[PDB]
Amino acid sequence: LSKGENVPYTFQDEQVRSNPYIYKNHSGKLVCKLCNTMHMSWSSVERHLGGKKHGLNVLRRGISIEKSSXXXXXXXXXXXXXXXXXXXXXXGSVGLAIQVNYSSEVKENSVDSDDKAKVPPLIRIVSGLELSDTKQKGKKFLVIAYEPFENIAIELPPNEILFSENNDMDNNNDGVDELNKKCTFWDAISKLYYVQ
C-alpha cells in the first residue's frame, strides 16, 4: 500500500516527497505534522489523507502561507474507440483538435430506454498523480468518456494550449463545466465527438 515510497523519519534532517507531511517520529508510528495526528498503518494514513480533517488543516496552512506572504448501473464493455488527433492552428496561437468516432448502430440496437441516452460524451482534465499502478506521473490527460465505450486519454505536456480568454459572451448554462460547453461538439446524428 506504500507504493514503495520511502518516508524519512522526522529526526533525519531533510529527493522530493510526494506529500511532505506524513512522517515517522522518533518512534515507529506515522504522523501528520500539520494535523498532529498519529496513525498506526499506512491504510489509516490514507484514511487521514482522504478525510476532511487533514484537508481543513491543509487549507489553514495555505492561509498561513498567504499570511506570511447512476454510478452503479454504469454499463461497461471497455471497448477502445478510434481517436483522430490533429495539430490545429488559428488566430493567435496553436490548439489541439480530436475527432472521436462511435459505433455504427451495431450494438446500440439493444439499449434504448432513455437512460442517459440523451447525455453526450464528457471530457475532463486529470492529473497523473493518481493511477491504478502509481509508478510514474507528472503530466495531464484529456480524458473522454461515454457510458458503454471505454475511457480514452491524451497526454498534455504543454502547460497550456488553446486555453482561451472569454471566447463567447458569458452565457451561463454550465452543462458540466466551462471546458465542455466552451470547446466541445457532439454530432449525435453521426456519432462524432469533436474536442478543441
Partner RNA sequence: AAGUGUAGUAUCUGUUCUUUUCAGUGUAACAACUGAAAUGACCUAGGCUCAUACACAUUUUUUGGCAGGACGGGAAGAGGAGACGUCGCGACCCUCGCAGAGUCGUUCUUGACUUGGUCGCUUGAUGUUUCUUCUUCCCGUUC
Report the residue from 21, 22, 39, 186 that binds RNA according to the rule CB under 7 A. 39
Neighbours of 55 (CB within 10 A): 13
Q: How far apart are CA 98 and CA 84, in angstroms?
A: 6
User: Which residue reads 481517436 in cell numbers?
Assistant: 83
The Cα-based distances of 163 to 10, 94, 180, 196 in angstroms read: 41, 10, 13, 10
Counting residues that bind Zn ion (by CB under 5 A) gives 4
Closest to RNA by CB, 71 vs 87, is 71
CB of 145 to RNA, least distance (A): 26
Residues in 107-166 at the binding interface with RNA, rule: CB under 7 A: none
Which one of Zn ion, RNA, none is in contact with 40 (Cβ closer than 5 to 8 A by kind)? Answer: RNA
Which one of RNA, Zn ion, none is in contact with 22 (Cβ closer than 5 to 8 A by kind)? Answer: none
What cell was used for 86?
490533429
Closest to Zn ion by CB, 7 vs 156, is 7
List of residues 6+ apart from 184 with CB closer than 8 A: 123, 193, 194, 195
Closest to RNA by CB, 51 vs 62, is 51
Q: How far apart are CA 49 and CA 22, in angstroms?
A: 9
Closest to RNA by CB, 40 vs 131, is 40
List of residues 6+ apart from 144 with CB closer than 8 A: 98, 100, 121, 122, 123, 151, 152, 153, 154, 193, 195
Closest to Zn ion by CB, 34 vs 154, is 34
Q: Determine contact, residues 80/100, Cβ cutoff 8 Å.
A: no
Residues in 43-82 at the binding interface with RNA, rule: CB under 7 A: 44-45, 47-48, 50-54
Residue type, 54: H
Which one of Zn ion, RNA, none is in contact with 44 (Cβ closer than 5 to 8 A by kind)? Answer: RNA
- Choices 32-40, 71-79, 144-152, 166-174 (CB under 5 A): range interacting with Zn ion: 32-40
Report the residue from 23, 30, 54, 193 that binds Zn ion according to the rule CB under 5 A. 54
Which residues are near RNA by CB under 7 A?
A: 35, 37-40, 44-45, 47-48, 50-54
